[PDB]
């Protein structure tokens, strides 16, 4: 008989709707330097640039076209510290401490006709995600809880520590409900990690402070949804003979006589898209500040194309320009981590030479 590879891959089954619209990171890289291992942003749109290639290959030193994706990256708020001990079958959280309520200043309040400014505060936007926050939680209580956690670390029951951070869509005026994420910290010593998280508890983190230009990353997000799709589109089966009187976009035979059952491997219709996916080795071309990209120390250009990004507003905060495309619809929350399985001859860790940036109307 004639052989051929099977239609589609079995390594992404079941092809079901993602458990949570907020992506989860299962594995983290091993880095000596002490820093947060990743960041979060919102997908804005796509554009292209012309750059002198510095990555190894045939096209080295020659100007090349390059598509890039824009992620708006408002600063994250570090508002929790969590500790992990070693359980019987794996890591188990031992304790977790969140900072007490503090006033919120970066809220873009508007003065409407009547009434004063809303005068928002933390624990008020966070309620939209948690809905059950501490009451009468004071600085002394927080200090004693931190001391207890530090004493536990000193005793040595703690094998890991991680940071609880929150997004701030309100500063960019996207929405108000924040997304809470848990991030591992690079390094080796739990004491160093604890000090690093503690010094930033209740404060802000910037992608400029976290990541490095020209480094490889992995992008995690939930892909665009397609609804129910037949096998032709879901798995890539071949259309049946044009003379078929019972349809063309269906599998011919769903199994032999024996086994007397339908094998799970037979392509079939179902959910397509909205899957949790990870893309490896995506280069971080640039990091821009306040929606502006600096080219030659005397030229700066607004990254927003004329008329704005389609189905998106205007980039007003820090942002990331990455090579290639990324999963997720527009405005999706995108997580990025340092390269987990990078190649051996990596590109230099520095911004490339960008000769042109496209800001023409993309609509």
């Amino acid at each position: 008989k004639v052989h051929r590879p099977r239609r589609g891959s079995l390594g992404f089954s079941p092809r079901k709707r993602a458990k949570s619209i907020v992506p989860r990171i299962r594995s983290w890289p091993k880095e000596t330097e002490v820093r947060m291992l990743g960041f979060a942003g919102y997908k804005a749109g796509m554009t292209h640039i012309l750059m002198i290639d510095d990555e190894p290959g045939l096209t080295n030193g020659k100007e090349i076209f390059m598509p890039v994706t824009i992620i708006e990256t408002p600063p994250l708020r570090v508002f929790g510290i969590r500790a992990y001990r070693m359980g019987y079958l794996g890591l188990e959280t031992a304790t977790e401490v969140i900072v007490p309520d503090f006033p919120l200043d970066n809220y873009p309040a508007k003065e409407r006709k009547g009434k004063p400014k809303p005068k928002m505060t933390f624990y008020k936007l966070l309620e939209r995600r948690i809905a059950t926050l501490p009451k009468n939680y004071t600085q002394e209580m927080f200090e004693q809880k931190l001391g207890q956690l530090e004493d536990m670390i000193k005793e040595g029951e703690i094998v890991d520590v991680r940071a609880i951070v929150a997004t701030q869509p309100w500063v960019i005026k996207l929405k108000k409900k924040p997304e809470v994420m848990e991030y591992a910290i690079g390094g080796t010593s739990v004491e160093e990690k604890f000090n690093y998280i503690k010094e930033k508890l209740g404060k802000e983190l910037r992608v400029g402070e976290v990541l490095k230009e020209g480094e490889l990353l992995d992008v995690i997000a939930v892909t665009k949804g397609k609804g129910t799709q037949g096998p032709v589109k879901r798995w890539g089966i071949k259309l049946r003979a044009h003379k078929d009187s019972k349809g063309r976009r269906k599998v011919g035979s769903i199994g032999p006589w024996h086994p007397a059952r339908v094998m799970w491997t037979v392509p079939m219709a179902g959910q397509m898209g909205f899957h949790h996916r990870t893309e490896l080795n995506k280069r971080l071309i640039a990091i821009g500040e306040n929606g502006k990209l600096k080219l030659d120390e005397n030229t700066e250009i607004e990254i927003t194309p004329k008329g704005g990004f389609p189905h998106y507003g205007i980039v007003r905060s820090d942002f990331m320009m990455i090579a290639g495309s990324v999963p997720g619809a527009i405005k999706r929350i995108i997580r990025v981590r340092p390269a987990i399985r990078p190649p051996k001859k990596k590109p230099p860790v520095q911004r490339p030479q960008i000769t042109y940036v496209s800001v023409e109307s993309k609509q």
Partner: protein, 142 residues
Amino acid sequence: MRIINAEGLILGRLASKVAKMLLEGEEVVIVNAEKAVITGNRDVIFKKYKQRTELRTLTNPRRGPFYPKRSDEIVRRTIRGMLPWKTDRGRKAFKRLKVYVGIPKEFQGKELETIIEAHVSRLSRPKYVTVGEVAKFLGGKF
């Protein structure tokens, strides 16, 4: 509730005795499942356990024999094989068994029972491998 240290005990004989205890309504806790021994040839034992692991249902992997890869799970399944697992009595008996690797702090400082009828001193030649070695070859956690 009896606690048995499995160090230096033949897996099959220990399992037979423990299953007999379980069928009479006695709670049992094995504390060193990784230190049990299996007599025979290393390659034969490893091949048998690999075959057991690769046994699976073709129509649906979510239903095939979930044979174990950990030491404690291996001991648990060995004991289960000797119980009337298809009956309510056997199921209740199996619900009365706990198996652990190493001594957890919970069971620390407690009497450890040993089975004379299953010690390695019986064997003429100590040609065996440990359940921990089998688990390591299988790729289990411990």
